[PDB]
């Protein structure tokens, strides 16, 4: 991000404001957990689920206009969007409830794969030129380990 | 791009190498000239159709691996791509023909809107951060004028 936005503490907490009705509540729970663990492993940061709106990364599902004045757009297209590291809406991540959300092998979009990407933005990662990476802004389904040299080099540029 | 690549001659030529069967050849050429007519007005450049490989911007359709080593991906995902001005393959614009090319409201990706974006890339524009611009790297069908200030600030920066 412009001016290299990054967290200035290591215990990044997340709150899930709501759940989509495509998956069971707890599948989605795990789906997010694993997405953080993708980043906890390569960062000096740790990720703590909490139940409090003072959480760093607040997470929600939502259709069209949903608060930030950055409305979604129906089926397909915008999958989800995440804001840089900072106070308030910064850090958050929303998922277009008009997209069918599921886990890999499902017809719909991988909530884990899309959550993986969103959380990288929340950590200060923008998009990557490398078409094979996670922060590459084109969702291709993958059963292989979603991180790649470029996602990790980015995140090490930020938090060491 | 990082070096701000541009043309170094004002009278650009173009060759429509091969055709999709999605449209008429006569509509495709016209679609094509109508996208050069977005960039001809706002620049010192003219855009002359030739019938030669020695053309500056060579337009070809292709599936998967197709000569440039930047393969496509079946229907959806990639629509097309172009390379900043320069010799040979630079300036060229390639259309994934695993996409139903069309015009207007309905099925298909408008070859005209798609080409306009493509042809601004071949003059050396990158993508635009402004979600309503032609050079926004996301396709939304509009029946309105595809050129916005940001796009015109773009090529003015290169040539104007
Ligand atoms: C908040 C937004 C911005 C959001 C997102 O990022 N959230 O984090 N969207 C993504 C929208 N795209 C971008 O943000 C972006 C930023 C910088 C560069 C690019 C870009 O290069 N996109 C690819 C465009 N293609 C070509 C191109 O543009 N040639 O000119 C490239 C490959 C050369 S394309 O062939 O698909 C193409 C796209 C649009 C046009 C076009 C546009 C306007 C008019 C006419 C045509 C033409 C070609 C895209 S998003 O759709 O919600 C999204 C997308 C992917 C993922 C993800 C990625 C990896 C793994 C799992 C999931 C998550 C979300
Ligand atoms: Ca959407
Ligand atoms: Ca937040
Ligand atoms: Ca949904
Ligand atoms: Ca060329
Ligand atoms: Ca395609
Ligand atoms: Ca076709
Ligand atoms: Zn939002
Ligand atoms: Zn993204
Ligand atoms: Zn190509
Ligand atoms: Zn583009």
UniProtKB/Swiss-Prot annotation, chains A, B:
Binding residues for Ca(2+) 2: 56, 88, 90, 92
Location(s) in or outside the cell: Secreted, Extracellular space, Extracellular matrix
Induction line: Activated by 4-aminophenylmercuric acetate and phorbol ester. Up-regulated by ARHGEF4, SPATA13 and APC via the JNK signaling pathway in colorectal tumor cells.
Highest taxon in the source lineage: Eukaryota
Binding site for Zn(2+) 2: 117, 121, 127
Binding residues for Ca(2+) 1: 22, 97, 99
Family of this protein: Belongs to the peptidase M10A family.
Role, per record: Matrix metalloproteinase that plays an essential role in local proteolysis of the extracellular matrix and in leukocyte migration. Could play a role in bone osteoclastic resorption. Cleaves KiSS1 at a Gly-|-Leu bond. Cleaves NINJ1 to generate the Secreted ninjurin-1 form. Cleaves type IV and type V collagen into large C-terminal three quarter fragments and shorter N-terminal one quarter fragments. Degrades fibronectin but not laminin or Pz-peptide.
Subunit text: Exists as monomer or homodimer; disulfide-linked. Also exists as heterodimer with LCN2. Macrophages and transformed cell lines produce only the monomeric form. Interacts with ECM1. (Microbial infection) Interacts with Staphylococcus aureus protein SSL5; this interaction inhibits MMP9 activity.
Domain characteristics, as noted in the entry: The conserved cysteine present in the cysteine-switch motif binds the catalytic zinc ion, thus inhibiting the enzyme. The dissociation of the cysteine from the zinc ion upon the activation-peptide release activates the enzyme.
Additional facts recorded: In the arthritis patient this enzyme might contribute to the pathogenesis of joint destruction and might constitute a useful marker of disease status.
Protein name: Matrix metalloproteinase-9
Record organism: Homo sapiens
Lineage: Eukaryota, Metazoa, Chordata, Craniata, Vertebrata
The gene coding this protein: MMP9
Residues included from the entire protein: 110 to 444 of 707
């Amino acid at each position: 991000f412009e001016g290299d936005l990054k967290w200035h503490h290591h215990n990044i907490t997340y709150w899930i404001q709501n759940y989509s009705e495509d998956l069971p509540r707890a599948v989605i729970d795990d789906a997010f957990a694993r997405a953080f663990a993708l980043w906890s492993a390569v960062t000096p940061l740790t990720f703590t689920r909490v139940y409090s709106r003072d959480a760093d990364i607040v997470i929600q599902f939502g259709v069209a206009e949903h608060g930030d004045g950055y409305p979604f757009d129906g089926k397909d297209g915008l999958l989800a969007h995440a804001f840089p590291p900072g106070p308030g809406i910064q850090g958050d991540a929303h998922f277009d409830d008009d997209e069918l959300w599921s886990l890999g092998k499902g017809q719909g979009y991988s909530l884990f794969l899309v959550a993986a990407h969103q959380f990288g933005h929340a950590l200060g990662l923008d998009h990557s030129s490398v078409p094979e990476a996670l922060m590459y802004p084109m969702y291709r389904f993958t059963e292989g380990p979603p991180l790649h040299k470029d996602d990790v080099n980015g995140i090490r540029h930020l938090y060491g």
